[PDB]
Amino acid sequence: EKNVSIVVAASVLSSGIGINGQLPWSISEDLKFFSKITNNKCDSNKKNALIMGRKTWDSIGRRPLKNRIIVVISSSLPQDEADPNVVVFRNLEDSIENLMNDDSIENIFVCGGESIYRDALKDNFVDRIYLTRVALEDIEFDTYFPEIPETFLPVYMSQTFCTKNISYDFMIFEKQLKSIDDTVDLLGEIFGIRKMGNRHKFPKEEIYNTPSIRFGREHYEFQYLDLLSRVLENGAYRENRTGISTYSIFGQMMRFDMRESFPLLTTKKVAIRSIFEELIWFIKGDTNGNHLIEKKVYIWSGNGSKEYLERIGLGHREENDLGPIYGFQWRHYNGEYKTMHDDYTGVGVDQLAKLIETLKNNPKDRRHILTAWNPSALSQMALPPCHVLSQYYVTNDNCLSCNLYQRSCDLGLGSPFNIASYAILTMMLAQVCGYEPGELAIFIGDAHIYENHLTQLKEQLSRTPRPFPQLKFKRKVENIEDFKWEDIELIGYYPYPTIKMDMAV
Amino acid sequence: EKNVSIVVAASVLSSGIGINGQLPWSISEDLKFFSKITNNKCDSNKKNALIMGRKTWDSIGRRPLKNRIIVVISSSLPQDEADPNVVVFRNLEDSIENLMNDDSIENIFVCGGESIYRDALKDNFVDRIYLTRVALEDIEFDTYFPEIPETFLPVYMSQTFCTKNISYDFMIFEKQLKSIDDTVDLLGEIFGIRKMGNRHKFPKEEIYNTPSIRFGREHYEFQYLDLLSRVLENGAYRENRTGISTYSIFGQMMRFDMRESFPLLTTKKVAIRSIFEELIWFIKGDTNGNHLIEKKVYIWSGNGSKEYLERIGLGHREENDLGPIYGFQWRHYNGEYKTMHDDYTGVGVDQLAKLIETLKNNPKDRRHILTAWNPSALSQMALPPCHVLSQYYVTNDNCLSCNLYQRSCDLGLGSPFNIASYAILTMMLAQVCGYEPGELAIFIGDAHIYENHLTQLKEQLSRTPRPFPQLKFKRKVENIEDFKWEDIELIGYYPYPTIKMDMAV
């Protein structure tokens, strides 16, 4: 018995692999990945056999690959005994004689050919599958990769990488000490909630997104999905200011990469425009909710309504005057707030300006902090800061990383919007200060799920993640307040259908 | 061949197991652990054999244990053929006939007897060791547990549990798929710093605290030690405001249990008194450094000196006037600071009082937040807030959990002090509001190690952790500012010797 793995780069959705006898993309990192994954061996006296179709053999210019033996499947190509590195077989089955004979082969790889892939799956010869998903679908294909049968299960999903503004992943599909575990279980039986391990139980398979991927959960959307599962598992059913109770856990975190991708969820279509518009609405220090409604953004409607304002003791306030909320504390901290129409120029502390100036004039500083929690202004605010305080960090390789603490997190609505918002903000601060995006760490206090989002989020958990999109700015601005929606280019975003969820006012 | 494990509860330091023919402690959880770990089996048709000394057999009142076969080692006790659950052998070697014969035995356990333990180790018959470390040493022993030979390695260390104010651990000593790993390594070779996984490399064995414990690192001091290893591994060498450069990483966290223990480091003797004194110094809202110095606490000496103050542009300030720092922002937020001698009573916003009142009048609130970051007062402060913002959470079972965000962390000096300080603070807030301590999560921004603490911390990493101590209050106070050092009782703290490290001014 010898291992036979499949290596293939297909598109994310339609699984296209070629067009007009060639690849519909040019990713050097992918070809390098193929090279290293096919050259991987233990015995130095052995080589790896590469099975490919005749047309694929024509595609590579009919030239052998070093340290490997290319096996060409063709009904016309003569058995060339000249080249000792290339061999031709009449059928796929006979080509796999490497098992019974020729001990100079350590591993067998199916490298390409839809006609080859399909009958390599149909006749069941494949043990492992190395799938390289590529994020582009608005192009033309003529050669596709056959749908993976249910006999295979994903065991690995790498982070999203970027080459020429193209997002791509690396996945592995597999055909499928006791003492410590037993001891921990026993301690979990003796001590109940006393044992902290029992307070943080591992999510069950029924609510675990892609359960088959256990040790290879490298994709950073899992940082959010596994959190969703954790709140779904250990979430204490508790009440709150709203009539809708939540299942809540305390003390969590999510990590994200922004260098090679953009942390925008693919399991659900997220309204990016509203996120950006809200972000620049903050940056300007604007507190007028109507300005968001005029631009068809209704995320501050429920927390802005006259009824809600009169209910929280702000009946004197205008229809959509949210008060000294986010942005007003960014640009005018400790500034005496009157109405949303007043001109607060020069008043208060401009945290954003000092933040930028400190970021570019003193990068290795440890005080790059933007806060929104003002005890003196909390009573005037329509809604206390959820994404409370953020800190920024300039790495040695000129990258900008962002940490955000969030006191309360709506994993259904608030969370993705926050992730994307601070990602975009980090990118803006990066471009303005002349840096590159780095990492985004979000530390969550009260991580909760509303009881009216149960079926929806459980539906979202039933979706296997896709590679993160890319976010590029079309122009470089001099002032951070000059960003426009037309200046934003979102590349390679192919998410699952949107999920309608109601906001608890 | 059959597995032979040793089960033993010994003291943490001198490894005492008995006194005057009985146990020097009474822990029901420990005896229950013994019962479950000795009753653990696969075959229902088989039983487990329990080998013990004659004196141990006398200790249990000479009564058999259910579902187990007790093997008594004695040169005087007659071979009782009456009881089929108890059997007597003349020597330990002959006693291990359970291997060659009697297939009705599935596992073999050495349950007690120093005379038995010592020659069970000396003749090498033991495969596994279940050690229950107990935290008390100021008592009398007459029977000890022999020192574990180098042939054994720890693979597990449970969290610290508490019974009758006694701390204890559960440890296991053992006598000692590739595809995903290969793929990740290859991707790490192709992509360099581009791959985020390579930016967060797993610490090397040379700087990994107790490397043998891989999957059983349950002890929560590992939350700090593994962080130390991570910064020691991936730490970017960068400069700062002080002349001493640091190795720094960004975005980390540490979790801690406070229900069954107290997160005070045992790998280094931490000055708990200074921590507490600083804490109540904060609670009172005092900014006078001398008040801390008068009580022989010199942690705020360097950041208070006249030279340092004049250097940071505060030459007008008195010898130890630290300005609107911690406590002043807790009790008098946005209060105009003059000197440390002025009476700031009634002025500013009392965050702490409102925090307590909200905690006891509305536990399920999501705004339980105490902040210290005030942009308007940063220029006056001798040192901007490191432990910036904290949030508190009242669980359904009336427990108090605490989250703390820290912008900058000195893993040598500041970190343990912060952990212990907010732990004690959480306990105080728990008692005052009528709750019990829960969990402590610390989210760290700039986690760094000063270059003059290298050899010291590398020395600290060479010490295998001991169970966390216990913290009990001797009296219940009506006001949180009424806490005294005499009211604090630290039980079972047996740490490694102190490690002298200098503070970078």
Ligand SMILES: NC(=O)C1=CN([C@@H]2O[C@H](COP(=O)(O)OP(=O)(O)OC[C@H]3O[C@@H](n4cnc5c(N)ncnc54)[C@H](OP(=O)(O)O)[C@@H]3O)[C@@H](O)[C@H]2O)C=CC1
């Ligand atoms: N993204 C990726 O990883 C890869 C993409 N590609 C792309 O896909 C395309 C190639 O795939 P495709 O269009 O399907 O062409 P194929 O490479 O699959 O053609 C295979 C050839 O092998 C011979 N052959 C196949 N099956 C049999 C059989 N059962 N018995 C005898 N001979 C057989 C035939 O040659 P003959 O005429 O002699 O009978 C056939 O033309 C190209 O555009 C290529 O660039 C290719 C490889 C990898």
Ligand SMILES: NC(=O)C1=CN([C@@H]2O[C@H](COP(=O)(O)OP(=O)(O)OC[C@H]3O[C@@H](n4cnc5c(N)ncnc54)[C@H](OP(=O)(O)O)[C@@H]3O)[C@@H](O)[C@H]2O)C=CC1
């Ligand atoms: N903390 C823990 O987990 C445990 C603690 N303990 C404590 O330890 C103490 C008891 O241990 P200890 O004092 O060492 O006494 P032991 O338990 O080791 O019993 C020793 C007896 O076993 C017989 N024996 C021992 N070795 C031999 C041998 N090589 N050949 C023949 N017979 C042998 C002898 O009995 P004989 O007189 O017939 O010759 C001897 O007196 C108690 O205080 C007990 O409470 C005990 C078990 C567990």
Ligand SMILES: CN(Cc1cnc2nc(N)nc(N)c2n1)c1ccc(C(=O)N[C@@H](CCC(=O)O)C(=O)O)cc1
């Ligand atoms: C047409 N074709 C098939 C092809 C293309 N992309 C793929 N991409 C993936 N992820 N998997 C495949 N099996 C795959 N196959 C090609 C084209 C070029 C090379 C190639 O040049 N390989 C060199 C790469 C050289 C290098 O980057 O160092 C090697 O040494 O293996 C291989 C296959």
Ligand SMILES: CN(Cc1cnc2nc(N)nc(N)c2n1)c1ccc(C(=O)N[C@@H](CCC(=O)O)C(=O)O)cc1
């Ligand atoms: C004297 N002695 C030896 C003893 C005491 N403490 C230990 N503690 C540890 N961790 N390990 C040991 N091997 C151990 N042995 C004892 C004393 C009581 C019981 C005992 O009561 N066993 C019951 C436990 C009943 C229960 O608590 O539920 C059982 O069912 O096995 C066992 C051994």
Ligand SMILES: Cc1[nH]c2nc(N)[nH]c(=O)c2c1Sc1ccc(C(=O)N[C@@H](CCC(=O)O)C(=O)O)c(Cl)c1
């Ligand atoms: C400002 C605010 N107040 C909230 N109160 C509760 N209970 N939960 C919240 O998330 C919030 C928020 S932030 C927020 C973010 C996104 C939305 C939102 O529109 N979510 C929907 C629709 C998005 C859209 O198309 O605009 C979704 O993502 O599926 C809303 Cl209502 C509020």
Ligand SMILES: Cc1[nH]c2nc(N)[nH]c(=O)c2c1Sc1ccc(C(=O)N[C@@H](CCC(=O)O)C(=O)O)c(Cl)c1
């Ligand atoms: C207040 C302050 N200022 C700091 N500046 C830098 N660069 N680093 C820091 O950790 C700090 C701190 S916090 C702090 C905490 C404990 C101590 C401290 O005295 N540690 C001693 C033990 C405590 C004692 O007995 O004083 C030690 O670990 O050897 C000090 Cl100096 C400062």
Ligand SMILES: O=c1[nH]c(=O)n([C@H]2C[C@H](O)[C@@H](COP(=O)(O)O)O2)cc1F
């Ligand atoms: O960015 C946001 N993210 C978020 O999750 N919320 C939710 C969290 C909470 O469920 C609700 C109200 O906050 P509070 O917990 O103080 O009632 O708003 C609000 C935001 F602005």
Ligand SMILES: O=c1[nH]c(=O)n([C@H]2C[C@H](O)[C@@H](COP(=O)(O)O)O2)cc1F
């Ligand atoms: O509780 C504390 N913990 C701590 O780690 N520091 C250290 C962090 C930093 O290395 C130094 C000064 O902070 P900054 O980064 O602003 O120089 O004080 C200070 C405290 F008060």
